[PDB]
């Protein structure tokens, strides 16, 4: 459906879901989620036991902090949930940017990867164009930055 069927594993330690999934103690416990990257303010208090990164549209300027947050979680064997309102566009864009940086993928191959786990994934055209620009002008330096910081 238009807001998914629950939070979905994309890669080991990386999940995408909607705002409801991000408050679902049963899903969070089952998927051992200890980090949440929120691209939508549910107006509800943060949960205990979880490290948050909250992003208040230009998402490119948030790629670096988002990738660091996800990557440091995954390198320590923990699990991160990225969510927005529907888990279709905003969170998906951030996760595509991450996949592009830890692989040699362009944005379309990264979107294929997200859709393999979360079939409702569908960034809106504005974010597709930001990801196109990212693929052409910046992902190669992000890839080098990741190697210099984390080996």
Numbering used by the authors: -1 to 54, 61 to 155
Please give me the paper's original passages concerning this structure:
This enzyme is broadly expressed in different tissues and plays important roles in the regulation of signaling pathways, such as inactivating the T cell receptor (TCR) signaling pathway, activating the JNK signaling pathway, and regulating the phosphorylation of focal adhesion kinase (FAK). The phosphatase domain of DUSP22 consists of five twisted β-sheets and six α-helices, and the structural scaffold is similar to that of DUSP3 (VHR), while DUSP22 does not contain an N-terminal α-helix surrounded by the N-loop. In this region, the catalytic activity is facilitated by C88 in the P-loop and D57 in the D-loop, and the hydrogen bonding network is formed by D57 in the D-loop, S93 in the P-loop, and N128 in the N-loop.
Structural alignment among N128A, N128D, and WT_VO4 revealed that N128 participated in forming the conformation of the D-loop. The negative charge from D128 in the N128D mutant induced charge repulsion against D57, which resulted in unclear electron density in the conformation of the D-loop and slightly shifted the N-loop. These results clearly indicated that the N128-D57 interaction anchored the D-loop and stabilized the conformation of the active site. N128A and N128D increased the KM more than 30 times, but the kcat values were different. In the N128D structure, the charge repulsion induces D57 to be unable to interact with S93 and substrate, which decreases the kcat.
